[PDB]
Structures are given as C-alpha cells and as structure tokens.
Design a protein around this nucleic acid. Structure first.
Ligand SMILES: [Mg+2]
Ligand SMILES: [Mg+2]
Ligand SMILES: [Mg+2]
Ligand SMILES: [Mg+2]
Ligand SMILES: [Mg+2]
Ligand SMILES: [Mg+2]
Ligand SMILES: [Mg+2]
Ligand SMILES: [Mg+2]
Ligand SMILES: [Mg+2]
Ligand SMILES: [Mg+2]
Ligand SMILES: [Mg+2]
Ligand SMILES: [Mg+2]
Ligand SMILES: [Mg+2]
Ligand SMILES: [Mg+2]
Ligand SMILES: [Mg+2]
Ligand SMILES: [Mg+2]
Ligand SMILES: [Mg+2]
Ligand SMILES: [Mg+2]
Ligand SMILES: [Mg+2]
Ligand SMILES: [Mg+2]
Ligand SMILES: [Mg+2]
Length: 148
RNA sequence: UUGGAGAGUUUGAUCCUGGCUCAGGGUGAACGCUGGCGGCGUGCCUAAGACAUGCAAGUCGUGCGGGCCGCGGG
C-alpha cells in the first residue's frame, strides 16, 4: 500500500432552471516515498466519493522516479499549457523547497532534496500535471547510454 | 553546482490574460503603548538658515636684543 495525500478539494457548479447544482473534485497524489508516485483526479456529487474516486485513478496512472540519494538526476523544465515547473537537483542537507502542490507530489515520491520553482499559470490542477510529466521525463546515465 | 515555496481577488462554474494586495529581509528612522541591567556600535537625513560664552595652534632663551619681578651679591 501507499501513503496518500489530498492536495486539492474543490466545489464547482453548473446551471439549470431552479438554480445552481454542485459537483466536487479532488486532486490526489499517492506514493510509497521510495520511487513511486501517481496522480489522480476525481469528481463526484459529494466530497468523500470524489476523494475515493480520485485515489483509484491515482493508482491507475503511476510513474517511476529515479531517485539518486534522494534527489533527481538532472534539470527538468516542463510546460503544461500555460503552466511551467522547474525541478532542479539539490545536494544533501537542502530540503524540499516547493509549493504545497509539487511539494506533496515529490514528497510522496521519496524526493527528500530538491530545488523547485513554479512559473506561469500556477493553477493547482495544471501545475500538478506539469510536475508529473516532468518526472515521467527524468532519465539516468544508464537510460542514456542504452538509447545511444 | 550548498542554490530558487507562494497566496488572496474578474466567474453561476472553467481555463487563460492582467493588474491590485499580502506573508520576508532591511533603515542614521519616526509615532503609539510599555519599559529592568549591561556590553559594543551609533544619533540634525530638515534651514550650507541665524548664533550668546568658553575651548579647538602653537612652540623654541641651544637664534637676538629687551622691559618688569625675584634668588644671588657689588
Ligand atoms: Mg525511468
Ligand atoms: Mg506558452
Ligand atoms: Mg496552465
Ligand atoms: Mg549533482
Ligand atoms: Mg499570471
Ligand atoms: Mg493565481
Ligand atoms: Mg546551477
Ligand atoms: Mg516566495
Ligand atoms: Mg469580486
Ligand atoms: Mg468579465
Ligand atoms: Mg463571486
Ligand atoms: Mg494573480
Ligand atoms: Mg517590513
Ligand atoms: Mg517610542
Ligand atoms: Mg516613555
Ligand atoms: Mg553607550
Ligand atoms: Mg546637514
Ligand atoms: Mg526660510
Ligand atoms: Mg532667522
Ligand atoms: Mg584648552
Ligand atoms: Mg637653535
């Protein structure tokens, strides 16, 4: 099993005669703090089901981060629409320096030491997607020598 | 490679653009309430407006001639 954290829980509305009627969403990451994270987005008529629905997707889309002594191997800059995330490798006693969104994403991934920065649209849902697709594009010296 | 966190606010709801605003550190500071000791710094940022009084540049008789006073003694 994994450690699980709810990063976002929001309410949205739609309109029809008689007035507004709501729907809830939850951005949820899940991970072992040992090289495995997954991000899931769940929407439902009530908070709990959405949180649970989210968790199922989180496990449905996962990714394997090549941790090297608790930091990422190389620079990664990634855009997701108008959102940009910078992940920069950091030495031992550094700490995890990121906003509560990529913080929880990287944290549950076993990342213990990292310099980061959000640029552009800091919309919670998009910055999430950009942090993940960044990891999914992380490589190591092995991976490289094998390609080339 | 010793180094980089963001949030609030346009919408019924969304994504984006965009500004406004905030949390930080800093100061020869000032103001309010309050105020026990000590150490080290430090204190007219305005009128280079105006200033009472004292003090801040003198020293040498191993350059010279003197006046006064004194010790000496003619
Ligand atoms: Mg890999
Ligand atoms: Mg772009
Ligand atoms: Mg975006
Ligand atoms: Mg390195
Ligand atoms: Mg912007
Ligand atoms: Mg924003
Ligand atoms: Mg660098
Ligand atoms: Mg910041
Ligand atoms: Mg408003
Ligand atoms: Mg409008
Ligand atoms: Mg409103
Ligand atoms: Mg803004
Ligand atoms: Mg201040
Ligand atoms: Mg005072
Ligand atoms: Mg007083
Ligand atoms: Mg003193
Ligand atoms: Mg002056
Ligand atoms: Mg005048
Ligand atoms: Mg006058
Ligand atoms: Mg004097
Ligand atoms: Mg002489």
């Amino acid at each position: 099993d994994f450690e699980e954290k709810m990063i976002l829980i929001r309410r949205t509305a739609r309109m029809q005669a008689g007035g507004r009627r709501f729907r809830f969403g939850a951005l949820v990451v899940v991970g072992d703090r040992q090289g495995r994270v997954g991000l899931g987005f769940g929407k439902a008529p009530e908070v709990p089901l959405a949180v649970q629905k989210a968790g199922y997707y989180a496990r449905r889309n996962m990714v394997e981060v090549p941790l090297q002594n608790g930091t990422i191997p190389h620079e990664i800059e990634v855009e997701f629409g108008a959102s940009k995330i910078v992940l920069k490798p950091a030495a031992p006693g550094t700490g995890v320096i990121a906003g509560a969104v990529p913080r929880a994403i990287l944290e549950l991934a076993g990342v213990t030491d990292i310099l980061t920065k959000e640029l552009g649209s800091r919309n919670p849902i998009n910055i999430a997607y950009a942090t993940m697709e960044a990891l999914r594009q992380l490589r190591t010296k092995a991976d490289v020598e094998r390609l080339r």
